[PDB]
């Protein structure tokens, strides 16, 4: 007694109209580390908490470049992200060589949605197990997005995904009026992101080894700050 004959394939609707295999996927995003993103009117920021195995292994990165004006952070199955971020790098390059115009961020959403799309409507496969927070700076200034494996890309002002991400999202939801106005100054937009992320720590605290950051905006091509260089925020 008590089975669920509707969760075997991404290609089956449960009596109520739910796609359980896709649901289970999101569940794997929750099991991954946390990552935060927030933006003003001159920059966007990604703050991530790298994880690791032993005191001997390295911390697995989670920030990825895509062009001089675009990037994302991830949560969940590393490989899936690779494929996705990669498909993205391609889409931007086309829109660059052929038309000679920097791919707008919203577009990058549609694109990542329609690709994630295909995997929820056909037999044989499985849905991507990974969420991404994309940031960029097109002709409409700053931009932040949040994509989920169901193909749902939503454009926010800030956010976090990952285990315990909850607390950080709360924080961001209050400090909003404050940072949405941090224009012209990047160093403060990041200190904000770092505060918000700490609202999600339980084991340790952020050290120079497990903290990653990234920014992009007005006069700041997407660059990533790693280790020994993010010290002035710890």
């Amino acid at each position: 007694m008590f089975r669920n004959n509707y969760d075997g394939d991404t290609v089956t609707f449960s009596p109520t109209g739910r796609l359980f295999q896709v649901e289970y996927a999101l569940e794997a995003i929750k099991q991954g580390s946390v990552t935060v993103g927030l933006r003003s009117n001159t920059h966007a920021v990604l703050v991530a908490l790298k994880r690791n195995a032993d005191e001997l292994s390295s911390y697995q990165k989670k920030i990825i470049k895509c062009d001089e004006h675009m990037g994302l952070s991830l949560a969940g199955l590393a490989p899936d992200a690779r494929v996705l971020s990669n498909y993205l790098r391609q889409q931007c390059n086309y829109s660059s060589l052929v038309f000679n115009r920097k791919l707008a961020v919203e577009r990058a959403g549609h694109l990542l949605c329609d690709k994630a799309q295909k995997n929820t409507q056909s037999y044989g496969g499985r849905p991507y197990g990974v969420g991404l927070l994309i940031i960029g700076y097109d002709k409409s200034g700053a931009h932040l997005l949040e994509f989920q494996p169901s193909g749902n890309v939503t454009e926010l002002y800030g956010t976090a995904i990952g285990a315990r991400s909850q607390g950080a999202k709360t924080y961001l939801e209050r400090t909003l009026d404050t940072f949405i106005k941090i224009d012209g100054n990047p160093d403060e937009l990041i200190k904000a992101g770092v505060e918000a992320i700490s609202q999600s720590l339980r084991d340790e605290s952020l050290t120079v080894d497990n903290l990653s950051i990234a920014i992009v905006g007005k006069d700041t091509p997407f660059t990533i700050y790693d280790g020994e260089a993010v010290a002035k925020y710890i």
Partner: protein
């Protein structure tokens, strides 16, 4: 349906998670030490009967010390069975709409409910009319009743019973074994309390663990979250 919503609301407010958690804390400290207490209370009571010689004198009175244990036991079972029904009432009223999907939590509910009922069965004991599993359960919480009924039948064959004129005899025995059996009925029912309580410890400790782990799912069997549809 604003009134139908009300009824269900008041129901779950009468028996919150706090009500059942309190029951677990009590079992954690108080109730467990009490069982361990009743354990040795009848342990030494069994040692006494082992070093005694029974004569016609002991058939003319019921050992008050033993009635003190079987009573103290019946009391404990009573409490537990009621404290359990509390935990059960907390869950039963939180079993969601019957569906053919999203029953991952519901399964947990039914699972714990089963272990609880298995506990209530032990305390309630065997009885005298029986469930297909028999009476492999030590002794019910009606030990007092069964005990007096067992001893009573033997006190009639021994003192025997009667009339007058000429001699009080009537029938008594010579069966030397029937006298030793009166001694065993006092010894056994004291052993049955040792065991019944030893196992009852285990059972209670189990339910505590089982509860403290799955409690979240017990209260929230389903976690609504429509992020896909919009």
């Amino acid at each position: 349906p604003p009134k139908r919503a009300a009824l269900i609301q008041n129901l779950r407010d009468s028996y919150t998670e706090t009500s059942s958690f309190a029951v677990i804390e009590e079992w954690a400290a108080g109730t467990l030490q009490e069982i361990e207490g009743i354990a040795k209370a009848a342990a030494e009571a069994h040692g006494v009967i082992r070093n005694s010689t029974y004569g016609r004198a002991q058939a003319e009175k019921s050992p008050e010390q033993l009635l003190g244990v079987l009573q103290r036991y019946q009391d404990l079972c009573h409490n537990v069975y009621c404290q359990a029904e509390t935990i059960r009432t907390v869950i039963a009223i939180r079993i969601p709409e019957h569906k053919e999907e999203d029953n991952l939590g519901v399964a947990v509910q039914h699972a714990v409910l089963k272990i609880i009922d298995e506990l209530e069965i032990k305390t309630l004991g065997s009885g005298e009319k029986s469930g297909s599993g028999g009476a492999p359960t030590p002794i019910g919480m009606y030990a007092l009743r069964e005990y007096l009924s067992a001893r009573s039948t033997v006190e009639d064959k021994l003192l025997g019973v009667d009339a007058e004129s000429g001699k009080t005899k009537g029938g008594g025995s010579q069966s030397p074994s029937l006298l030793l059996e009166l001694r065993q009925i006092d010894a056994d029912f004291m052993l049955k309390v040792e065991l019944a309580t030893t196992h009852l410890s285990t059972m209670v400790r189990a339910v505590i663990n089982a509860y403290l782990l799955n409690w979240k799912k017990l209260i929230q069997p389903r976690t609504g979250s429509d992020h896909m549809v919009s």
